[PDB]
Design a protein around this ligand. Structure first.
Ligand SMILES: Nc1ncnc2c1ncn2[C@@H]1O[C@H](COP(=O)(O)OP(=O)(O)O)[C@@H](O)[C@H]1O
Ligand SMILES: [Zn+2]
Ligand SMILES: [Zn+2]
Lengths: 283, 689
């Protein structure tokens, strides 16, 4: 038995449990879910995707809730999404390859070896918008129904940083780890050392697209007393210019918190945190 | 120099008041079993999250000591002081004696309850290995186990704290019974030097922030150690403890970096509000000044704007002084940390039935004639006219909200006007219904009423966001809005009102505001004709200045106008002189019901969702056609007013629903609509006098 710290997740046990579902689902919600022909319900949609290049796997989360063997998982991806979706990125690639090796096939191999697959889980339960999102709900899957009032310009955000060395003709690169660029003081000594002389070059670096969107949020019920909230939310690459002003939307993502700098002078941070949604899917 | 920090001592002795608490939490059965232990089993069941401690039990616990000759060493006179000590030490005992978990840890549970479980488990394994390694190193529990505890370093019990702890005071009843602790003080009366004390204050909650997380502890991760670093955050601000303080890097050359974890960081739900002084408690000539209240944890949504509350809590300094020059040293701001709340007009949404509230409903019913009993019990301080006051009870119960299941909604609510001449009191009825209505609100013709009936937009003082601030129709919702001097309003006011009677929403499209906004308000209006009094030579469509399109949104209008008379004015002059001779109301074989119990009865009736019989369905139709045929074909001359409409048929239905709800009846009789039609017609038969 293996387990993640602070967490109820076993990698291999979830890995096999997701495959067991992925290779056996057939609309059991119609049978089981409530008082409401097909077969291989996802395998058709996976063997659909591989010729189209559409790397996205849009997932109806409630498939799992009704199904016999992954009630053990619905309440995990809902509550540990950053880690449980990081598992799905791997399992689906291995579960694509099982459909290679069982097939006499052309060279799909030479790219899907390297390319990356992802999940967008959207079909989750309802919530009273921002308001019911007490801090126990931090870092969980969530959805919002509402509309857009404005969207910012696209923001450049660092993903590989680059370092240029004022001497001796070697540069350096470092990948960002969880919000920091640990810039080496040492000149990559084995070439030679100079203590502090190295540069950081903007236009060599590799950037994500980022975008921020302002959502007027409109719950299915609101308490007596309330007024509309302008939530602020962020969307990453492959969703930028997906949705824009006046659209009426269901969106899902992770509810988050972040500090704010009090001023442009010094690193004192406000203790009363700011909150937002990191979007993972928009319907 | 021990003359610095000079030693002093005082009658308190916390080192044995903790010894008192450790009995009280287990030694109380005056109200499963030792209830605090069973409550802590529900924490060990993980089915509740907040602990409420009442002084009501501590006092009668000391009596079970004192009357047995056993020293009290009073907690209560201490606890009304200095509660920030007790509230962070009284909770330590509970960590040290609570039941073990019974419903075993499972996926369908709140995610924080496994994170804490894992650290609590890891805590014990560290003791279990270190003891065995010490024992294995070539050589008694109380000897050894203290070595393990000191050599280890562990998660603290405040960071494994499953729950939030709060206090409530003891009411005056328990202060005079067995013969202080909680006068509900005025914000003016607080006189400053109460800092530290547990106090009760009451007033209007004018303004609140939204709830957001505010951190109490920051958790930091260090890879090269693997040890976590926890920083307690106490002030408004912090600086990141980036330089790794770990016990493994301190005696090490490299001092490797660390990163914050934004779920291991213990938060709390933070909210705050202003209470403004309660106006009748303001002195002569003075102003309703304001106080700032801070909230933490499970209590957070118990405060909503535009309501009157007792707040009980601990009154404390904050470090602020002005701006440096406007200073005379060591000044403090002050705030109240809220602990428990009760509110004098209650939320209808909480209404469940328990051993004391059902009998308060039942004893009201069994005298019978309840509908007429409550009408006369509304505003009995003004004479007669029961038909008006009898309809005001229906305005409260309001009928039924209908959703078509197909994208349509129609108002389950009553909108009424009280047209008349001077001297037959209006604002007293408006004011009486503002008190009897939770979330009731009172308004006036002129001045601010453009914004005052609308969303403002405001840069929120405590946090860097804009908020819509609700005018009367939004400060009220699911409740009554009272309008006075009505026709002295203006087109910009009416065109806000006219939409709200028709439907539950408002819409705005100027400047930074583009929203559609939920009103859900009942409008009860007082208005006067063009000449104060009526003129009998003027037809009502000309006597009344209001346009009949807006008037058709009043489901009843009352032509509540006076005519002098020899007899009827005599009984009035008795009632007024009687009630002016003394507060008491007439010596009828009646009692005017206490309003709070009537509020409970209404809150039960609101739960009822009555259905119309086909017998009345076909009767309502035929009465409507005869009304509409008469109203059109005959009544368009002389005293005739208006026209019959679909809307007045829906009015009769909503009124007929309201009557059936006041019966507490699951169905609507033929006996109901023959009363509803009477109120519709009788409101204008006054005109023939
Ligand atoms: N029928 C009545 N019974 C008892 N008090 C009355 C009655 N009519 C008038 N009053 C007294 O007169 C005052 C009512 O003023 P009011 O007529 O409401 O002003 P407005 O002209 O704005 O309606 C109240 O203070 C009330 O005490
Ligand atoms: Zn160099
Ligand atoms: Zn460290």
């Amino acid at each position: 038995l293996r387990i993640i710290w602070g967490t109820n997740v076993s990698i291999q046990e979830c890995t096999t449990n997701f495959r067991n579902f992925l290779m056996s689902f057939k609309y059991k919600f119609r049978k089981i879910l409530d008082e409401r022909d097909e077969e291989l319900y996802y395998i058709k949609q996976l063997n659909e995707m591989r010729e189209l290049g559409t790397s996205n796997l849009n997932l109806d989360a409630r498939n799992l809730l009704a199904y016999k063997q992954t009630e053990d998982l619905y309440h995990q991806l809902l509550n540990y999404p950053q880690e449980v979706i990081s598992i799905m990125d791997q399992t689906i690639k291995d579960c694509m390859v099982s459909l290679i090796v069982d097939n006499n096939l052309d060279y799909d191999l030479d790219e899907i070896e390297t390319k990356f697959y992802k999940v967008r889980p959207y079909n989750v339960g309802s919530c009273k918008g921002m308001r019911e999102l007490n801090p126990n709900d931090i870092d969980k899957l969530i959805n919002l129904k509402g509309l857009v009032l404005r969207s910012t310009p696209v923001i450049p955000d660092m993903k590989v940083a680059f370092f240029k060395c004022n001497v001796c003709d070697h540069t350096m690169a470092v990948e960002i780890d969880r919000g920091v660029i640990q810039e080496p003081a040492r000149c990559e000594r084995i070439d030679c050392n100079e203590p502090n002389s190295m540069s950081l070059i903007h236009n060599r670096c590799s950037f994500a697209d980022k975008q921020v969107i302002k959502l007027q949020e409109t719950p299915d019920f609101v308490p007596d007393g309330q007024t509309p909230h302008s939530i602020s939310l962020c969307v990453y690459d492959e969703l930028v210019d997906s949705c824009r002003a006046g659209d009426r939307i269901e969106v899902t993502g992770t509810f988050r918190s972040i500090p704010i700098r009090a001023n442009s002078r010094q690193r004192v941070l406000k203790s009363l945190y700011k909150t937002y949604v990191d979007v993972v899917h928009v319907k | 120099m021990s003359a610095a920090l000079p030693s002093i001592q005082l009658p308190v002795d916390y080192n044995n008041l903790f010894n008192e608490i450790t009995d009280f939490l287990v030694t109380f059965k005056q109200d499963k079993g030792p209830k605090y232990m069973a409550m802590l089993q529900k924490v060990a069941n993980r089915e509740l999250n907040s602990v409420i401690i009442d002084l009501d039990d501590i006092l009668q616990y000391q009596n079970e000591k004192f009357l047995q000759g056993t020293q009290a060493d009073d907690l209560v006179s201490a606890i009304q002081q200095n509660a920030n000590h007790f509230t962070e030490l009284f909770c330590r005992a509970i960590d040290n004696n609570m039941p073990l978990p019974t419903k075993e840890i499972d996926y369908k549970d709140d995610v924080l309850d496994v994170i804490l479980n894992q650290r609590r488990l890891r805590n014990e394994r560290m003791l279990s290995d270190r003891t065995n390694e010490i024992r294995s190193e070539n050589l008694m529990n109380d000897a050894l186990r203290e070595v393990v505890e000191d050599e280890t370093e562990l998660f603290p019990p405040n960071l494994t704290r499953r729950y939030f702890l709060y206090f409530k005071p003891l009411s005056q009843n328990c202060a005079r019974r067995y013969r202080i602790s909680s006068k509900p003080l005025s914000v003016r009366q607080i006189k400053g030097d109460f800092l530290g004390q547990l106090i009760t204050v009451r007033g209007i909650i004018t303004r609140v922030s939204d709830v957001k997380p505010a951190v109490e502890v920051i958790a930091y991760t260090c890879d090269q150690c693997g040890y976590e670093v926890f920083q307690e955050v106490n002030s408004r601000t912090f600086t990141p403890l980036s330089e790794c303080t770990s016990e493994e890097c301190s005696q090490n050359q490299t001092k490797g970096q660390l990163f914050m974890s934004t779920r291991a960081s213990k938060f709390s739900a933070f909210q705050e509000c202003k209470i403004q002084e309660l106006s009748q408690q303001v002195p002569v000539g003075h102003i309703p000044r304001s106080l700032n209240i801070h909230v933490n944890g499970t209590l957070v949504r118990s405060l909503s704007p535009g309501d009157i509350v007792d707040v009980t809590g601990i009154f404390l300094p904050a470090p602020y002084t002005g701006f440096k020059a406007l200073k005379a040293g060591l000044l403090t701001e002050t705030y109240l940390e809220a602990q428990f709340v009760r509110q004098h007009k209650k939320k209808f949404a909480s209404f469940s039935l328990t051993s004391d509230v059902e009998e308060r409903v039942m004893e009201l019913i069994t005298s019978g004639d309840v509908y007429n009993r409550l009408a006369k019990s509304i505003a009995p301080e003004i004479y007669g006219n029961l038909d008006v006051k009898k309809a005001l009870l229906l305005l409260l119960v309001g009928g039924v909200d209908k959703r078509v299941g197909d994208g349509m909604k129609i108002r389950g609510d009553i909108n009424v006007c009280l047209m008349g001449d001077p001297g037959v009191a209006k604002s007293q009825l408006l004011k009486a219904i503002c008190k009897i209505s939770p979330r009731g609100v009172y308004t006036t013709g002129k001045g601010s009423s453009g914004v005052g009936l609308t969303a403002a937009v405001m840069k929120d003082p405590v946090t860097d966001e804009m908020i819509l601030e609700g005018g009367a129709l939004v400060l009220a919702d699911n409740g009554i809005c009272c309008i006075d001097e009505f026709d002295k309003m203006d087109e910009s006011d009416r065109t806000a009102i006219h939409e709200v009677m028709e439907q539950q929403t408002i819409s705005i499209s100027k400047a930074g505001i583009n929203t559609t906004l939920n009103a859900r308000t009942s409008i009860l209006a007082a208005a006067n004709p063009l000449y104060g009094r009526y003129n009998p030579r003027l037809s009502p469509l000309d006597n009344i200045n209001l346009p009949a399109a807006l008037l058709s949104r009043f489901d009843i209008l009352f032509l509540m106008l006076d005519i002098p008379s020899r007899d009827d004015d005599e009984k009035l002059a008795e009632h007024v002189t009687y009630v002016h001779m003394h507060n008491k109301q007439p010596d009828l074989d009646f009692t005017p019901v206490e309003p709070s119990k009537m509020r409970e009865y209404i809150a039960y009736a609101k739960t009822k969702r009555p259905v119309m019989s086909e017998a009345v369905n076909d009767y309502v139709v035929q009465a409507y056609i005869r009304l509409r045929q008469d109203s059109k074909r005959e009544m368009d001359s002389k005293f005739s007013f208006g026209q019959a409409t679909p809307r007045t048929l829906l009015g009769i239905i909503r009124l007929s629903q309201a009557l059936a709800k006041l019966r507490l009846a699951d169905m609507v009789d033929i006996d109901d609509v023959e009363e509803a039609l009477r109120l519709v017609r009788v409101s204008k038969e006054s005109l023939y006098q």
